[PDB]
């Protein structure tokens, strides 16, 4: 359980070839490609607004359409 | 409040987990597709059982749907962190501890979570192995089946628990 | 231009075989066949909005995939 | 603002008024039911190819600007979906595109970025319509929707031209 409904936000920065400098990492240099690479992790509250939820319902309600090339499991009858 | 692992610390981290660079690619394949992974899972759960958005169903109303979309994202993110860490301890404690009981008390249906989590698992495995329709991230071509299976194992812990 | 930033939101219901939703929203006459009497299109001019949470999640995806 | 429901006799009539009505409805279903991804993938593709767009001087910097761009991309997608429902682009060309280039010029919304977001949505919609998946992994009866895909492509080309 987590009372605040926080989850780990993991961010992956492969900044090889990225000409913008970032220096949030404060530890020692590796003197190789890892100086242009960073993983960021933080614990953040996860939230979804009812407005977003309403938009998702409108996407989901047709009950037939899918992503491209995925299994079809739709049914027209109550399962549970 | 955030931790930054770059330079020497990242060089070290890559040696403390198996297949460090591939593992970071695999994590990337999850986190850069987070919104659609959550969407497919809740959408598919619903198209298989449309009663979930009938007036008596557990995703009826924007409040209930928003909670389900939120919970799916939470579960997905603890899985992504397990894959980064090569360790499921935080997932098992912080995320899954007390969750089955919680859902039992609320009436959040186990068959619905079984299906949603199952779809997230398939979708993540496909992104990691690059069998999905979209292959937007750039990696050297190779065999990531071990990391994909490790990821699937973390989802299987979720399913088992619920 | 639309001052209210509306767009047409279309929903497509192929509800052939659905027994549990009463087909009452469509108020016109029947066709006499399932392909039309158990199918419906909904169209509504709607103010299009994107909430902070949705935008924030897209930004998180972007930040982990920027091309060098 | 009022929702319209078209079923029964009225839907049968609509299918006499537009070409390939059933296929058209399937195409619209695919696009609307995947709209959030179509939009987010286009806007995030525009950004991942040009990361300056979310640097502090970039036009998508901050949630407010990202939200406005996602919204506008959705507006455009929806007017295209409606064009595909209707069989023509008149509403798209008037309500959506009329004055839009000038609006964007007054706000400083970048033409190159818009061309790319629209271009990605185009490719995505064309691919949903010309989906070559096996029937087992296809929600609609398999067949040839190339005419409708080309029609859809044409509507996006009108957006690209206007902007
Ligand atoms: C996140 C969006 C996706 C992009 C972009 C992409 O390239 N692929 C994407 C999604 C994706 N989905 C799956 C697997 C499944 N999706 C569903 C739900 C879907 N099926 C339905 O019948 C309905 C309702 C009409 C849906 C919304 C299901 C059931 C699956 C398969 C789950 C399983 O096998 O257990 C994948 C993985 C495809 C694969 O496994 O080969 C991707 C990549
Ligand atoms: C998200 C909706 C989709 C579902 C569900 C699905 O199954 N496929 C979906 C989307 C889709 N996208 C494309 C094409 C492109 N998407 C991007 C953006 C992507 N690429 C990047 O480099 C980054 C940033 C790292 C992204 C976020 C791009 C650039 C394209 C290609 C556009 C072009 O061709 O010019 C398609 C089309 C695939 C096809 O043509 O067959 C789909 C279906
Ligand atoms: C190259 C892709 C690029 C161009 C060109 C441009 O205009 N902007 C670009 C990248 C970019 N990066 C970020 C945000 C972060 N980059 C990070 C990477 C590192 N941090 C470090 O300390 C190190 C050395 C080990 C890295 C390789 C991190 C951690 C980012 C997040 C910081 C945070 O927590 O906010 C952005 C977002 C805008 C910004 O914050 O600068 C952009 C556009
Ligand atoms: C069968 C798929 C099903 C089960 C089982 C279940 O529990 N719920 C099911 C379907 C379902 N449908 C809807 C909403 C709408 N269905 C519509 C279809 C038609 N309406 C008509 O008048 C006709 C005749 C031409 C149709 C084919 C429409 C238009 C719906 C939207 C209503 C609206 O805009 O509010 C839902 C959502 C919950 C509900 O309204 O029952 C569900 C779960
Ligand atoms: C399955 C996961 C997919 C796959 C992966 C794959 N990746 C590599 C090699 C590398 N990947 C990276 C990526 C990163 N390192 C970082 O520090 C960061 C940011 C935090 C990232 C994103 C790196 C640096 C490498 C090394 C090669 C290079 O110099 O770029 C391989 C090659 C084998 C290996 O172990 O190195 C593979 C196979 N490949 C696929 O086909 C899957 C879709
Ligand atoms: C390209 C668009 C994709 C494709 C489509 C395709 N669809 C059909 C056949 C049918 N589609 C429907 C769908 C509806 N009719 C409705 O009234 C509604 C709700 C408003 C929907 C969703 C119908 C009724 C048919 C007729 C056959 C049937 O009943 O199953 C075809 C077959 C050819 C035709 O025109 O009938 C095709 C090719 N197929 C693809 O492969 C593309 C991905
Ligand atoms: C979505 C796939 C399914 C679904 C979900 C659903 N969940 C709730 C409500 C809650 N969910 C939680 C979950 C957690 N607590 C934790 O500590 C953690 C780990 C960090 C998690 C994931 C909690 C605490 C609640 C109650 C409090 C809250 O909602 O904020 C609901 C709402 C139930 C209600 O009626 O209020 C729903 C709908 N529903 C489904 O049908 C899917 C199977
Ligand atoms: C996203 C791909 C691009 C982008 C978008 C962006 N748009 C705005 C602001 C506005 N957009 C409109 C658009 C319309 N007016 C109309 O009448 C119609 C047809 C119905 C449309 C689509 C308007 C009126 C505005 C101003 C009002 C408002 O934004 O609420 C912004 C700026 C938002 C801001 O200034 O805070 C942005 C960023 N930006 C990009 O970089 C992409 C190329």
């Amino acid at each position: 359980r987590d009372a605040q409904l926080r989850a780990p936000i993991v961010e992956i920065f492969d900044a090889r070839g990225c000409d913008a400098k970032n220096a949030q990492y404060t530890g020692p240099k590796s003197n190789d490609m890892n100086d242009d690479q960073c993983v960021k992790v933080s614990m953040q509250k996860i939230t979804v607004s009812e407005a977003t939820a309403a938009k998702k319902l409108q996407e989901f309600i047709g009950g037939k359409a899918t992503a491209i090339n995925v299994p079809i499991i739709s049914s027209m009858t109550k399962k549970y | 409040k955030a931790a930054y692992v770059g330079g020497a610390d990242l060089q070290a981290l890559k040696k403390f987990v198996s297949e460090g660079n591939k593992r970071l690619d695999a994590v990337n394949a999850i986190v850069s597709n987070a919104s659609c992974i959550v969407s497919d899972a809740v959408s598919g759960m619903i198209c298989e059982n449309p009663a979930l958005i009938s007036p008596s169903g557990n995703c009826y109303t924007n409040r209930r749907m928003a909670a389900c979309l939120r919970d799916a994202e939470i579960i997905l993110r603890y899985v992504s962190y397990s894959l980064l860490s090569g360790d499921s301890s935080v997932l098992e404690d912080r995320c899954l501890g007390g969750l089955k009981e919680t859902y039992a008390s609320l009436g959040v249906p186990a068959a619905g979570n079984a299906r949603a989590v199952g779809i997230m698992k398939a979708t993540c495995v496909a992104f990691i192995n690059n069998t999905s329709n979209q292959k937007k991230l750039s990696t050297p071509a190779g065999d990531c089946s071990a990391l994909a299976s490790e990821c699937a194992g973390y989802f299987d812990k979720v399913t088992s628990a619920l | 231009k639309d001052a209210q930033l509306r767009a047409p939101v279309v929903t497509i219901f192929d509800a052939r075989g659905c027994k549990d939703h009463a087909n009452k929203e469509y108020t016109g006459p029947k066709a006499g066949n399932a392909e039309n009497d158990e199918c419906c299109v909904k169209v509504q001019m709607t103010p299009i909005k994107v909430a902070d949470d949705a935008a924030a999640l897209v930004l998180k995806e972007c930040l982990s995939e920027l091309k060098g």
Side-chain angles (χ1 to χ4, degrees), chain A, chain B, chain C:
Chain A
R1 166 165 200 174
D2 191 89
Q4 293 173 357
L5 296 176
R6 312 185 87 102
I9 307 308
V10 178
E11 317 191 47
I12 301 298
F13 300 94
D14 182 6
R16 296 176 287 173
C18 170
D19 197 27
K21 180 185 179 190
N22 282 282
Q24 298 77 19
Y25 166 67
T26 54
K29 298 192 172 187
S30 61
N31 303 303
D32 73 357
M33 70 165 65
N34 295 277
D35 293 327
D36 289 341
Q37 300 169 320
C38 196
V39 176
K40 177 183 172 181
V41 183
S42 61
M43 295 296 303
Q44 291 186 28
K45 297 178 297 183
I46 305 308
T47 187
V48 176
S49 66
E50 290 189 6
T52 296
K55 295 178 75 175
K56 301 305 299 184
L57 171 64
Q58 186 277 332
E59 296 177 353
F60 299 167
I61 197 169
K64 293 297 191 178
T66 71
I68 299 175
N69 202 27
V70 307
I72 302 299
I73 65 167
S74 62
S75 161
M76 305 308 285
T77 58
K78 180 173 188 174
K79 303 291 200 201
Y80 53 90
Chain B
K1 296 177 181 180
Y4 297 90
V5 188
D9 290 353
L10 179 62
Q11 190 182 69
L13 179 62
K14 285 168 179 182
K15 303 176 188 181
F16 302 159
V17 295
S18 67
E19 297 188 305
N21 281 320
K22 289 168 67 181
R23 182 176 295 276
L24 298 166
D25 288 322
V27 172
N28 199 351
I30 299 171
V31 299
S32 284
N33 293 296
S35 62
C36 88
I37 290 162
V38 166
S39 186
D40 246 69
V42 176
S43 188
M45 178 188 66
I46 284 167
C47 75
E48 171 181 57
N49 184 24
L52 287 165
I53 50 164
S54 73
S56 64
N58 201 235
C59 282
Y60 191 68
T61 74
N62 299 332
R63 179 184 62 79
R64 292 191 188 90
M65 178 78 77
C68 177
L69 292 164
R70 175 202 64 194
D71 281 10
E73 180 176 349
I74 288 167
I75 288 165
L76 183 62
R77 290 202 179 276
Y78 278 96
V79 168
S80 73
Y81 181 74
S82 299
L83 192 63
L84 174 71
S85 301
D87 155 39
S88 57
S89 76
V90 173
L91 165 70
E92 291 180 40
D93 164 40
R94 193 165 292 289
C95 188
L96 297 180
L99 195 54
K100 179 184 173 187
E101 302 147 41
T102 284
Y103 285 164
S105 64
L106 291 166
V108 169
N113 271 319
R115 173 62 75 178
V117 173
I119 295 168
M120 297 197 288
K121 174 179 150 191
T123 302
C124 292
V125 167
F127 281 132
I128 288 165
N129 284 326
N130 229 5
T131 68
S132 42
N133 172 259
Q134 290 297 292
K135 312 175 177 193
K136 71 182 166 177
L137 302 176
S138 300
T139 59
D143 177 352
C144 299
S145 55
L147 285 159
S149 290
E150 178 180 343
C151 185
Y154 299 134
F155 282 112
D156 286 351
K157 285 186 162 285
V158 174
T159 289
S160 280
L162 302 181
Chain C
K1 291 203 177 184
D2 192 78
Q4 295 160 260
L5 291 179
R6 297 169 302 178
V9 176
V10 180
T11 315
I12 303 295
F13 298 88
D14 173 7
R16 288 178 287 180
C18 185
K19 310 300 171 186
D20 287 354
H21 173 87
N23 292 336
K24 295 188 293 200
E25 289 81 19
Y26 167 64
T27 63
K30 309 185 168 190
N33 50 73
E35 190 194 296
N36 294 296
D37 295 333
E38 295 178 2
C39 289
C40 195
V41 176
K42 180 183 185 176
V43 188
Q44 190 164 16
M45 275 294 271
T46 301
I48 306 304
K49 306 284 188 179
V50 175
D52 180 282
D53 57 301
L57 181 55
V58 175
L59 176 63
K60 289 188 178 64
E61 295 181 359
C62 291
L63 285 165
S64 287
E65 67 194 349
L66 305 174
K67 300 184 172 231

